[PDB]
Amino acid sequence: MEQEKVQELVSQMTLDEKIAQCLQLSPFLFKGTNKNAELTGPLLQEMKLTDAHTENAGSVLGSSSALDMIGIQEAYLKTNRLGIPLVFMADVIHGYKTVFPIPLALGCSFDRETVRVMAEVSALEATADGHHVTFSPMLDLVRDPRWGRVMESTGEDPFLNSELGKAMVDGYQGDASKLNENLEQMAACVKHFAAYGAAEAGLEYNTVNMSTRELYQNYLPAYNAAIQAGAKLVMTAFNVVDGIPATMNKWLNRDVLRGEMEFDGVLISDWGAVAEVINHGTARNPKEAAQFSMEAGVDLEMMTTCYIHELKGLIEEGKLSENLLDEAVLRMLNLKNDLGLFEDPYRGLDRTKDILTDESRGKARAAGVESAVLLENKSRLLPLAKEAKIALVGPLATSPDILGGWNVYGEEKDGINVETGLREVFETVEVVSTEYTELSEEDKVAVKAAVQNMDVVVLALGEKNEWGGEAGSLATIRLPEAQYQLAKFVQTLGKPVVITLFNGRPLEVKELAESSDALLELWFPGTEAGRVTADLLSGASNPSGKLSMSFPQTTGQIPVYYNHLRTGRPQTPENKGERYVSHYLDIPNEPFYPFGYGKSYSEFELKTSSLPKELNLGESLHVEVTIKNISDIAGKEVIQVYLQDVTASISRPVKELKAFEKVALQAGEEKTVTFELTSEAFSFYNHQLEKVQEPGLHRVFVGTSSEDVDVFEVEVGGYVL
Amino acid sequence: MEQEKVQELVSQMTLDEKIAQCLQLSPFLFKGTNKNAELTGPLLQEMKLTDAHTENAGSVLGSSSALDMIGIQEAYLKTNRLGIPLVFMADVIHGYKTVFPIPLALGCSFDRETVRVMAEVSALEATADGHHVTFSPMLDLVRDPRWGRVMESTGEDPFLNSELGKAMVDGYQGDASKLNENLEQMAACVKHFAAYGAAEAGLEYNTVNMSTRELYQNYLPAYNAAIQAGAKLVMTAFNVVDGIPATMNKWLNRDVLRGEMEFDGVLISDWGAVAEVINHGTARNPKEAAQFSMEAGVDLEMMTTCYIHELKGLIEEGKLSENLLDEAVLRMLNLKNDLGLFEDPYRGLNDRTKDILTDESRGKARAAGVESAVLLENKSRLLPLAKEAKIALVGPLATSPDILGGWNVYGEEKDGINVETGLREVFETVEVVSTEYTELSEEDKVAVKAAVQNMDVVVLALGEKNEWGGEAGSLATIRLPEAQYQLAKFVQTLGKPVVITLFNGRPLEVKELAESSDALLELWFPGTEAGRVTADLLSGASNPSGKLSMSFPQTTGQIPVYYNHLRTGRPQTPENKGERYVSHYLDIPNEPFYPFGYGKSYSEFELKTSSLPKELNLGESLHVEVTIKNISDIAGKEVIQVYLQDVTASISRPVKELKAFEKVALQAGEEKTVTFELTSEAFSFYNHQLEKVQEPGLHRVFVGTSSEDVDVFEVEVGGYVL
Ligand SMILES: O=C1O[C@H](CO)[C@@H](O)[C@H](O)[C@H]1O
Ligand SMILES: O=C1O[C@H](CO)[C@@H](O)[C@H](O)[C@H]1O
Ligand SMILES: O=C1O[C@H](CO)[C@@H](O)[C@H](O)[C@H]1O
Ligand SMILES: O=C1O[C@H](CO)[C@@H](O)[C@H](O)[C@H]1O
Ligand SMILES: O=C1O[C@H](CO)[C@@H](O)[C@H](O)[C@H]1O
Ligand SMILES: [Mg+2]
Ligand SMILES: [Mg+2]
């Protein structure tokens, strides 16, 4: 409908109606839900909720289905005074029913289009099952693989997360202004604002702390890119930011998000995060919690009752301006309108035919093959011949747990396990399945026997997803020790070994790499994992992923990341072995596998056209890269361009990723791609918080990982374009 | 002399002269040195130094002896135009020749007097051997035991480090207005300014980064306390602080150090930290390095040549003002003066040798060792051991002379007392099988089996070599070599009671050691009398009374873990135990293996807090009164501890903060009363705007014998301001 009528609806609301609009609830607390009705009484009573609260609640999160949604919205609109429909939100993180690779894997794709296809397919399916909003993209920069939630981030690099973050939003929302029309798309909600993934000790919900300059330089860029690209919501974070819980952080949310970033959409709290400021000890009680969170501009309280029970009193005693509430309600209604819920509360609703199609599955498969990373492949063991005799052993041989974490809707019975997968392709396969956390003598005899018959071992190891995701912090980033022992065992059997590793985080893999001939990191590919796995092993697909997060030498190296500072005593090749340089006595400084590292069955040669020696301030560097696949085999490479600022008023990272592109090349084929490094890429935040460019020398690095690069020099100065 | 004669020295000094006054060099680049006279030729020619440079050099670092000093100074004065003597500095960190426990151990003493006596004995000896300035206390807060330098800090607590920091300055310098008179006292230099101990990944020299508020709240207090206690010098840090290397960080050093902390002394660079701002990528070359460090107020460049080769040109070209150099030179001379060098450039050097490595001094180092060690485990009263107990003494620390610890630049191992020698003095029957640090052979095991079979108890002496810590001794995994845990596993199967005497420079993973033995005693590195420290504790001649000044993590992946932590929005409680969506790990407990303030005794105490007021005004002190009784037959010391928590505040506040502590001696039966004043400063914190503030509201007071063994009382602050 029209803006003016929305502005009117605010006018016509009671105070209690407005307060309730700022509440969000689980489906089974509304009249007319069709699942979990036997939890409605107990919980309603514990939250001290009444019919007036539930009949005016702003939103719903975690509807179980299209049918669940319809019954609730049909029932709500029957008893709702002014006919303000519910907005319905859900966690569509990496697939709705067609599960795609976990976002950390998606980052390893280094492939913008894959990310967009994933979100688009996800929206297709979610909108079809009644949901208006996904709580995705998750844009927290991660440098600490102990934290279970690294699985939701696209890795340790702000640029890559920024790009892929834009692709996710584009994919879910398409045209952000036609969400009232395009009902196969949905609102995206950026999370978690901000800096959540710097939790101390990878410990869930734990303290985050960093200088403001570093917050802007590295932790904010991606939330900003998604926002600037039209993301409709932002969700707050659980952590403090500089001492102050993000949910009630006024500078962060008013000054930075609404001020600097110009975000005039709904700001939703994370689950309980409004009331939990009480636990952080920056609010004495639910009254204070609500006052400070409203002051901060949190418009939608997620499944707690601070606003519901306390805003009226705050407004009547003049502790809190009613305009703030008014503005918050106005944002909620603008959201609903943008989704066309004033014309159609059922947002297009039967669409079952669209869920879990064969075209969608093929896409998830394509995502999986794009995202897997080949870490080792000694003496061309991979790809395997289709008639190769295979002992498939390990806990991931038959396990149905290949969908990854934050899979709220996808069903394991629709999944393709590794056995099924492999059997579709290779004729001879013998399988000895083993426990995730044990290695018995009986297992070893069975494995001995399966291996002796066969020609090659596919050793499938991995985590259960429940060992990652939210509140899945591992102090030690290792598989259960039994799996390292199973690899040591299997290696003694005389036969060639592939390890197909399934997980949600960087792990200590040195032992795995040292005990096998090849190692293929599939992360958690989703619904089609088995076939992703088979197509890569068989060569039907050629591995092309690159690591979007560093793989540490050991737990004690964390945090280790490619974009690191030099220090005053950097280790060089000409000071190696000296005592008084930055190093460890017991491990290398280098991570075991670095950012941008990945292998292929193909082989490539790159050359960079001549670049200018000199450059003006404000001027863009145009980089031209010619790349040839010099091998019999078709496949993709990921060209990567980095910049270093050799000298600056702040110590600058030795490298920073400024551009990348995945390039498909047939056997023999050659191509040219060109990048624009605009002058922003030469910029940084200074000691005073200004975004600035300084004349001086930069190095440009073109290559195929953060470490395989040719290096060029460029001098910036003169005048400003 | 008088300040006029000093002000005039500045006026009469040439430019080239004033510059060289801002240079410090190793003893063997000087004419007159009694050691390393080779090396002088090539290093001078590498540094492109002259005689103009060395004849006017400001200072020396790390002279080898009183004769070295005297030789250098005598020869320098002979050819020095205006007669400005050299100031002579050194790393006297935990002792000179009589070596005391490493500073981390000293922290575990929880005893100010012990620390002051260490510092006092250290200056006594150092001045006797020619040194004017020590590079100590090291006041970097440490939360990460991977870092080799945790050995030099007194731990993870700002308050404790502040207090013991002042005891150290007080002990080295006594009354600092009379350093020209008490020539058995010496100038002290606080380091490393600032926040150096927060090195990322505990990796040496690595990036440091934290909000300015956190810098002020936790990382600054100790530097500040030592400075306010009158510490003569400060040294810069190798690390960046918010992007900028500390050495050229104007705000940190002009605004914070010289402005807010009102420090008007020499600011010395750390070794090469001036030229090294180039490697940090905040200076193109020695010209800018020099410019930016002088702009920042660095007065003395340590063993690099940016100032000497670049300050002339910078001043002539007008890029840098001669006033800065001048005031820099004035602080230099004011320090020489304060030291009494214009009256006596040999600072009293008169058979000061009678003063070194004395019997009284060694007895003090010994007492420091027994104060500082920490009894971590003692099941079924195995310790103390009867003096007629037959002892199998096995392990790498059985006979190792490596017991003086790291940053021991002057102490000699031949004077050290090793564990066998210590034990043999006390217990009649000792059999000894030494093993390697990093191995466990089948032959070793056979020998251990045979020794243990014969004796009644195992003293299993495990440890680090000191070179696995100190500077640039970072460990990614904080474990002993695996052979040592395997040795403990082995010994435990021999059916005899086991004590592990652990010697180290950092918190280690010790769950496996605790689990494979009946008692565990953490001697750290006690210094010259290590063996007797160990024997006395084991025997009961001394009663363990140390407490942990740094948390002992469950495993490496728990780092950083410390007592003074924030609550988060989803704290693990005893009520929510076992729930998935709470702050916790899947594979280990939240808690460290041993917490801050944790320590055991052969004695047993009760404590009783006198009734506290329910309310308090702003600006008002809280007087906590504690009665403590040793209810046991054994005399011993206990460390009463008082913490505060600010329950609600404009910033999420630590669950606990140590605000007072005292070590209380007690005979069997004996009772005493101590009272502490927690001022309103203790109730204060830094807010978002960076004001030091006090908020009305609820605080909890915790009185006890560790961060975990406490009685909790509440106090409500408000009303008006005192
Ligand atoms: O706890 C949470 O619940 C939210 C709702 O499921 C989810 O979207 C957030 O990412 C997560 O932090
Ligand atoms: O609610 C959840 O469900 C998921 C189940 O797939 C789990 O992995 C997530 O980490 C958890 O947040
Ligand atoms: O961290 C900082 O960097 C700046 C430069 O050191 C300084 O000027 C600011 O006041 C300070 O907060
Ligand atoms: O490198 C160093 O040398 C200095 C000189 O010994 C010492 O005092 C510092 O603590 C240390 O950083
Ligand atoms: O980090 C910060 O936290 C402060 C409190 O939110 C804010 O006011 C400042 O702008 C900022 O320096
Ligand atoms: Mg530059
Ligand atoms: Mg308070």
B646 annotated as a binding-site residue: yes
What dihedral angle (degrees, nearest 10) is formed by the CA atoms of B527, B531, B532, B533? Answer: 60
Instruction: State the nearest Cα–Cα gap between B558 and chain A, in angstroms.
Output: 6
Residues B338, B372, single domain; the answer is no
Residue B591 near residue A475 (C-beta atoms within 8 A): no
Interface of B with A in 589-618 (CB under 8 A): 590
Q: How many domains is chain A partitioned into structurally?
A: 3
Q: Dig out the tokens for B328 from the structure.
A: 């820099």
CA pair distance B223, A716, nearest whole angstrom: 41
| Nearest residue to A410 (alpha-carbon basis) of A467, A356, A349 | A356
Coil, helix or strand for A684?
A: strand
Pairing of strands B87-90, B59-61: parallel
Experimental approach was X-ray
Q: Which atom of ligand 4 lies at the shortest distance from residue B90's CA?
A: 6
State whether the Cα torsion B312-B318-B320-B322 is positive or negative: positive
The CATH code of the domain that includes A348 is 3.20.20.300
Q: Which atom of ligand 1 is nearest to the CA of A238?
A: 12
B270 is known as an active-site residue: yes
Tell me which of A143, A147, A203 to substitute to probe the interface with B (most B C-beta atoms closer than 10 Å).
A203
**Same domain for B67 and B134:** yes
**Minimum-distance ligand to the CA of A60?**
1
In whole angstroms, give the CA distance from residue B619 to residue B336: 41
The residue type found at B346 is Y
| Identity of residue B324 | L
Closest Cα to atom 5 of ligand 1:
A271
| Residue whose pair of structure tokens reads 């004395």 in the numeric block | B358
Length of chain B: 722
Q: Which residues pair with B666 in a beta bridge?
A: B636
- Co-location of A201 and A264 in the same domain: yes
Q: What angle do CA B91, B306, B186 make, to 5 degrees?
A: 25
Q: What is the DSSP string of B564-615?
A: S----SS---TTTTT-SSSS-BSSS-SS-SB-TT--B-SS-EEEEEPPPPSE
Task: Decide: A293 and A269 in contact? Cβ < 8 Å.
Answer: yes
Chain center to CA of A573: 36
The Å distance, Cα A16 to ligand 3 centre, comes to 46
Preferred mutation among A219, A247, A302, A567 to probe B, highest tally of B CBs within 10 A:
A567
For tokens 């907005």, the residue is A87
Q: What order do you get walking across the sheet with B657-666 strand by strand?
A: B615-618, B710-721, B697-704, B636-646, B657-666
| Whole-angstrom distance, CA of residue B321 vs CA of residue A80 | 76
Integer angstrom CA distances of residue A88 from A131, A299, A301, A345, A646: 5, 15, 14, 10, 50
- DSSP code per residue over A350-382: --GGGTT-HHHHHHHHHHHHHH-EEEEEGGG-P
> Which two tokens mark A287?
């009254």
Mutation to probe ligand 4, out of B134, B153, B471, B474 (largest number of atoms < 8 A from CB):
B471
List of chain A residues whose C-beta atoms are within 8 Å of the C-beta of residue B693: none
Phi, psi (deg, nearest 5) at residue A720: -100, 125
Taking only residues 243 to 262 of chain B, the set having a beta carbon closer than 8 angstroms to any beta carbon of chain A reads: 243-245, 251
Instruction: Residue window 450-469, chain B: list those with CB within 8 Å of chain A.
Output: 468
> Which DSSP category does A556 fall into?
G
- Is the Cβ pair A201, B561 closer than 8 Å? yes
Radius of gyration of chain A (CA): 26
Ligand 4 centroid, distance to B358 Cα (angstroms):
28
Residues measured by CB to lie within 5 Å of ligand 6, the ion: A 645, 647-648, 694, 696
Rg (alpha carbons) of chain B, rounded to whole number: 26
CA of A594 to the centre of ligand 6 (A): 25
Sign of CA pseudo-dihedral B506, B509, B513, B514? positive
| Chain A positions in Cβ-Cβ contact with residue B650 (cut-off 8 Å) | 244, 282
Q: Residue A295's closest CA among A261, A273, A272, A324?
A: A324
Pocket of ligand 5 (CB under 6 A): A 212, 242, 244, 249, 251; B 211, 688
Whether A652 is in the pocket of ligand 1, judged by its Cβ within 6 Å, is no
CA distance B280 to A648: 9
A504 burial (CB, 10 Å; 0-12 / 13-18 / 19+) is buried
CATH (domain of B709): 2.60.40.10
Token pair for A59 = 């939103």
Residues B461, B317 within the same domain: no
Task: Answer for the pair A90, A134: CB distance below 8 angstroms, yes or no.
Answer: yes
* Largest separation between any pair of C-alpha atoms in chain A: 82
* Amino acid type, A676: E
CA end-to-end span of chain B: 44
> Is A100 found in the same domain as A201?
yes
Burial of A721 (0-12, 13-18, 19+ CB in 10 A): exposed
The 10 Å Cβ neighbour count of residue A212 is 17
Produce one character per residue of A680-690: b if its CB has 16 or more CB atoms within 10 Å, e if not: ebbebbbbeee
CATH value at residue B553: 3.40.50.1700
Residue B493 in contact with partner chain A when CB distance is under 8 A = no
Q: Are residues B464 and B530 in the same domain?
A: yes
Chain B contact present for A204, CB below 8 A: yes
Place of tokens 């040719």: A710
Q: Amino acid identity of B601?
A: S
| Domain final position from A356, A375, A402 | A356
- Of B185, B189, B211, the C-alpha closest to B198 is B211
Positive or negative: CA dihedral B69, B70, B73, B76: negative
Q: What residue numbers bound the domain in which A451 lies? A: 357-603
**Which ligand minimizes its atom distance to the CA of A135?**
1
Q: Give phi and psi for B470, each to the nearest 5.
A: 65, -155
Relative to beta strand A390-394, strand A266-268 is: unpaired
User: In angstroms, rounded to a whole number, what is the distance separating the alpha carbons of residues B132 and B233?
Assistant: 12
Q: Is the CB of A238 under 6 A from ligand 2?
A: no
B341 and B265 in one domain? yes
- B542-567 as b/e, with b when 16 or more CB fall inside 10 Å? bbbbbbbbbbbbbbbbbbbbbbbbbb
Helix H segments across A136-235? 158-173, 212-214, 221-228
Indicate the burial class of A147 (C-beta count within 10 angstroms; 0-12, 13-18, 19 or more): buried
Name residue, tokens 């008893």: A79
Please tell me the distance in Å from A228's CA to the nearest CA on chain B: 27
Residue position matching structure tokens 């859900």: A90
> How many Cβ atoms from other residues are within 10 Å of residue B287's Cβ?
18
Looking at residue A46, its amino acid is E
Evaluate whether B88 touches B66 at the Cβ level (below 8 Å): no
Residue type, B549: S
- Residue A346, classified by CB atoms within 10 Å of its CB into exposed (0-12), middle (13-18) or buried (19+), is middle
As a three-state string, the secondary structure of A41-99 is: HHHHHHCCCCHHHHHCCCEEECCCCHHHHHHHHHHHHHHCCCCCCCEEEECCCCCCCCC
User: What contacts B574, CB < 8 A, 6 or more positions away?
Assistant: none
Tokens encoding B57: 């050099």
3-class state of residue A111 by DSSP: coil
B11 phi/psi in degrees, rounded to 5: -55, -45
Euclidean distance between CA atoms B145 and B158, whole angstroms: 16
Full strand arrangement of the beta sheet holding B671-678: B605-609, B622-630, B671-678
Cβ–ligand 2 distance for A407 under 6 Å, the answer: yes
- Domain termination residue (choose one: B604, B620, B640): B604
Are B273 and A568 in contact (CB < 8 Å)? yes
Q: Which residues contact B539 (CB under 8 A, 6 or more apart)?
A: B384, B385, B387, B426, B427
Minimal Cβ distance to A281: which of B210, B590, B647 = B647
Q: Which of residues 630-649 of B touch A (CB under 8 A)?
A: 646-649
Q: What count of other Cβ atoms lies within 10 Å of the Cβ of residue B316?
A: 11
Q: What is the H or E stretch that residue A302 is in?
A: strand A301-302
Residue B652: its chain A contacts at CB < 8 A? 240, 243-245, 280-282
**CB proximity list for B215: less than 8 A, separation 6 or greater:** B194, B195, B241
Catalytic residue among B144, B157, B270, B355: B270
Residue from B294, B291, B234 nearest B265 by CA: B234
Q: DSSP assignment of A373-436, as one string?
A: EEEEEGGG-PSPPTT--EEEEETTTT-S--S-SS-SS--GGG---HHHHHHTT-S-EEEEE--S
A355 C-alpha to center of ligand 4: Å? 66
Q: Is A559 on the interface with B (CB under 8 A)?
A: yes
B242 → chain A, closest CA residue: A211
B363 and B328 part of one domain: no
Same domain, A561 and A653: no
B145 to chain A: nearest residue by CA? A556
Is the Cβ–Cβ distance between B89 and B59 less than 8 Å?
yes
- C-alpha distances in angstroms, A336 versus A296, A333, A342, B399? 22, 5, 7, 78
For tokens 């991995």, the residue is A462
Neighbours of A717 (CB within 10 A): 12
B564 and B417 within one domain: yes
Find tokens 């705000």 and name the residue.
B251
Angle between helices A529-538 and A358-371 (to 10 degrees): 50
The token duo for B160 is 């404790």
- Asked whether B415 and B353 are in contact (CB, 8 A), the reply is no
Residue B431, φ and ψ in degrees, nearest 5: -110, 145
Residue A283 to residue A293: CA distance in whole angstroms: 10
Question: Quick check: CB of A687 below 6 Å from ligand 3?
Answer: yes
Mutate to test the pocket of ligand 5, among B242, B688, B690 (most ligand atoms within 8 A of CB): B688
Q: How far apart are CA B104 and CA B507, in angstroms?
A: 10
Residues B588 and B610 in one domain: no
Helix (H, G, I), strand (E, B) or coil at A164: helix
- State the sign of the Cα–Cα–Cα–Cα dihedral B687, B691, B696, B699: positive
Helix (H) or strand (E) holding A638: strand A635-645
Q: What's the gap between Cα B603 and its chain centre?
A: 28
Q: Are strands A59-61 and A373-377 parallel, antiparallel or unpaired?
A: unpaired
Contact A699, A711 (CB under 8 A): yes
Give the H or E element holding residue A288: helix A286-296
- Which residue in A has a C-alpha nearest to residue B251's C-alpha? A687
Q: Give residue A393's identity as a one-letter amino acid code.
A: V
Within the 539-558 window of chain A, which residues sit less than 8 Å (CB to CB) from chain B?
A: 553-558
Ramachandran category for residue A340: left, alpha or beta (phi over 0 → left; psi -120 to 50 → alpha): left
The ligand with the least distance to the CA atom of B210 is 3
HEC states along B435-502?
CCCCCCCHHHHHHHHHHHHHCCEEEEEEECCHHHCCCCCECCCCCCCHHHHHHHHHHHCCCCCEEEEE
Residue that terminates a domain, selected from A337, A356, A375 = A356
Q: Identify the residue among B652, B657, B693 best suited for mutation to test binding to A, counting A beta carbons within 10 A and taking the highest.
A: B652
Give B227's strand partners. none
- Cα dihedral sign, A299-A301-A307-A308: positive
Do both B612 and B477 map to the same domain?
Answer: no
